[PDB]
Amino acid sequence: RMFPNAPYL
Amino acid sequence: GSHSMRYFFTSVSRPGRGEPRFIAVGYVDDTQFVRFDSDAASQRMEPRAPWIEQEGPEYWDGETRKVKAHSQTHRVDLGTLRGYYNQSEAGSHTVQRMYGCDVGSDWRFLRGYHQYAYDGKDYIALKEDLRSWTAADMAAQTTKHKWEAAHVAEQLRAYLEGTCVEWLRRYLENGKETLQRTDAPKTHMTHHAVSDHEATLRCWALSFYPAEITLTWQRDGEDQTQDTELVETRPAGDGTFQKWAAVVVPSGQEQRYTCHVQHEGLPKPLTLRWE
Amino acid sequence: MIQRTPKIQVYSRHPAENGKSNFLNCYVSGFHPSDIEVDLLKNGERIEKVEHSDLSFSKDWSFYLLYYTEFTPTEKDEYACRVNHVTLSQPKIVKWDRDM
C-alpha cells in the first residue's frame, strides 16, 4: 500500500 | 530471510506531445505486484501478481486515487525543476522517485528510504535516521526547505515504520506460496571448444528465487575474478531468475577449475567441476 | 545530461529443446533515459506478438525492461533482439545463442 502523497518538489 | 516493499515512479516530459508519461510499479522483494501506466486504457492501479488480485474494490479504488494524484504532482514537479535549473521548455526530462521499507528475518523494521532523481542524478534523499535530507545542489536545498517546513520527514517516518511494514507483512502472508518460498538454483555446466587448444566452461544457475546469488570460478582454489565472464542476473519471466559465469580453459586443464554457487536455497554452497 | 547504454541479453526462459514450447526473452538494463526501442526477430523479421514488463529501475536509477514472446525453437530458426537507444549510433542486434 502506497504513501498517500507525493510532496511537491 | 530479509524482505522489502518498494514503490518506483517514473515521470517523463514529452514537449509538443502533451502530458508527461507516468509509470508506477510496486514490488515485494523481487516480485512485482502492481502497476499504473498513464498512457494505458484503464486509468487504474492494476494487479501484476496473483496474490494481490484478492484485495477488494476498496484497495483498488484507494490505490488508483493515490496513484492518479501522484501523476499530477510529478507533472507539476517537472515544470518546477525546469524552473529551478533554467531549462528550456523544448527538452524531455525525467523525475524518478523510489520509496519503501526493509524488514529482517523476524519481519521487524530494519530501514526506510525515500529518494528522488532528476535526469538520472541523485536529487534529494531521506537519510537513514528518517529525519533529515541529503540535498545535491541549490535546487534540491530549495526542495529540502519546503519539506522541512511541511514536516514531510515526519509523515514519511510514520509510514515507513508503521503502514509500509504492516502492509509488507500482510502481502507476505497473503502471498505465502510465492513470496516466502526459497528456490535453490538448478545448476549445470557446459563445455564448448573455441579452438583446438581452448574451451569455454560455463556454469549455469537456473530457476532460483530470490534474485541474490554468487557464482564464481576458481582455478586450483584461486579466484578468477579478472578472467571470468559474468552476466547480470536476469529474469526468466516466470518469477524466477538466471545467471551464468564462464571461463576460458586451455585444453587439458578442465579439472583445475571449480564453479562455486551461493544462494539462500542452498544449505551448503555448491562446488561444481567438469569431470 | 546523463546517458547510459543498455546492456542486452537474449535468452530462453527454459533450456531450449527443439520442438518444445518456450519463451524468448530480451532483457535490457542499465540504461538512461527511458526511451528505448526493442524488437525480437525471427529469421530477421519483426515478431508482432511481443509483450514487455512495466518500466522499473535499479538502485542507481538506471532502467530495466524484459521483452518476451512465446516460441518453439527448432534447429534451423534464428532469433535475435534488436535494440535502439540514444547512446547507440545505430541499432544493436544481439543473436540468440542457446548456450548463453
Side-chain angles (χ1 to χ4, degrees), chain B residues 90-136:
Chain B
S92 181
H93 293 276
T94 309
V95 30
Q96 288 163 275
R97 175 190 191 198
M98 179 275 299
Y99 61 79
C101 50
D102 292 340
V103 298
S105 260
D106 43 15
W107 294 8
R108 288 186 176 268
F109 180 85
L110 229 31
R111 61 210 147 239
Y113 29 83
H114 172 276
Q115 266 154 47
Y116 279 72
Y118 182 57
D119 289 332
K121 227 172 190 80
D122 282 341
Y123 178 76
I124 195 167
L126 196 54
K127 294 188 133 122
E128 215 195 350
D129 56 14
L130 310 167
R131 252 175 282 149
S132 44
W133 303 96
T134 305

Side-chain angles (χ1 to χ4, degrees), chain B residues 8 10 27 32 35 48 96-97 115 117 119-120 122 190 192 202 204 231-232 234-237 242 244, chain C residues 1-2 7 9 11-15 25 27 29 32-34 52 54-57 61 63-64 66 99-100:
Chain B
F8 294 88
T10 310
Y27 283 76
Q32 206 201 325
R35 58 131 186 250
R48 297 296 273 171
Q96 288 163 275
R97 175 190 191 198
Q115 266 154 47
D119 289 332
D122 282 341
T190 63
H192 283 110
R202 171 174 291 114
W204 279 88
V231 291
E232 207 192 337
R234 72 199 188 185
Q242 321 180 337
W244 60 253
Chain C
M1 74 200 108
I2 274 156
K7 286 137 77 132
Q9 295 199 62
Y11 55 105
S12 63
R13 175 179 304 179
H14 304 270
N25 293 332
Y27 182 53
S29 53
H32 219 286
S34 57
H52 63 89
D54 302 311
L55 189 69
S56 187
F57 47 88
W61 308 110
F63 297 102
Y64 65 87
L66 177 67
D99 196 38
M100 292 175 74

Side-chain angles (χ1 to χ4, degrees), chain B residues 26-243:
Chain B
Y27 283 76
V28 170
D29 301 325
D30 302 307
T31 300
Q32 206 201 325
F33 70 107
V34 282
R35 58 131 186 250
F36 172 88
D37 183 347
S38 66
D39 297 3
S42 76
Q43 291 300 298
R44 311 264 314 160
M45 189 75 111
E46 293 179 328
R48 297 296 273 171
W51 51 264
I52 197 78
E53 284 158 29
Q54 51 198 289
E55 294 285 2
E58 199 290 315
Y59 179 93
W60 293 114
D61 294 1
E63 300 304 277
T64 291
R65 207 177 307 108
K66 296 169 185 169
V67 83
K68 270 158 82 165
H70 296 352
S71 195
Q72 297 319 284
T73 105
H74 295 315
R75 181 174 74 73
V76 177
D77 288 343
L78 281 160
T80 304
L81 291 152
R82 201 204 103 191
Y84 286 160
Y85 283 105
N86 242 91
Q87 283 161 335
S88 152
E89 192 152 352
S92 181
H93 293 276
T94 309
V95 30
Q96 288 163 275
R97 175 190 191 198
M98 179 275 299
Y99 61 79
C101 50
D102 292 340
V103 298
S105 260
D106 43 15
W107 294 8
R108 288 186 176 268
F109 180 85
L110 229 31
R111 61 210 147 239
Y113 29 83
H114 172 276
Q115 266 154 47
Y116 279 72
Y118 182 57
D119 289 332
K121 227 172 190 80
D122 282 341
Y123 178 76
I124 195 167
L126 196 54
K127 294 188 133 122
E128 215 195 350
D129 56 14
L130 310 167
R131 252 175 282 149
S132 44
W133 303 96
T134 305
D137 43 23
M138 293 301 166
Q141 275 148 45
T142 302
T143 301
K144 180 197 177 283
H145 300 153
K146 284 179 183 187
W147 284 6
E148 291 169 334
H151 301 295
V152 172
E154 231 146 315
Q155 308 155 41
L156 242 5
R157 194 171 180 188
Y159 170 79
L160 293 162
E161 276 174 29
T163 308
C164 190
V165 173
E166 282 166 355
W167 284 86
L168 170 56
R169 287 170 185 156
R170 165 176 181 148
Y171 295 154
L172 282 181
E173 295 158 16
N174 285 170
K176 182 181 170 156
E177 217 212 317
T178 296
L179 301 170
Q180 302 189 45
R181 78 188 199 279
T182 286
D183 288 339
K186 283 149 193 170
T187 62
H188 74 280
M189 208 183 285
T190 63
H191 179 283
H192 283 110
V194 315
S195 56
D196 81 304
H197 43 65
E198 280 173 356
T200 310
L201 279 180
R202 171 174 291 114
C203 189
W204 279 88
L206 291 173
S207 13
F208 57 88
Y209 187 86
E212 190 48 51
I213 195 159
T214 309
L215 232 59
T216 50
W217 274 101
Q218 291 162 14
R219 184 181 64 192
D220 299 345
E222 70 172 57
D223 270 296
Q224 297 301 287
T225 318
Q226 323 269 256
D227 290 293
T228 301
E229 171 160 34
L230 182 65
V231 291
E232 207 192 337
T233 306
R234 72 199 188 185
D238 62 355
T240 70
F241 291 93
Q242 321 180 337
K243 192 175 195 71

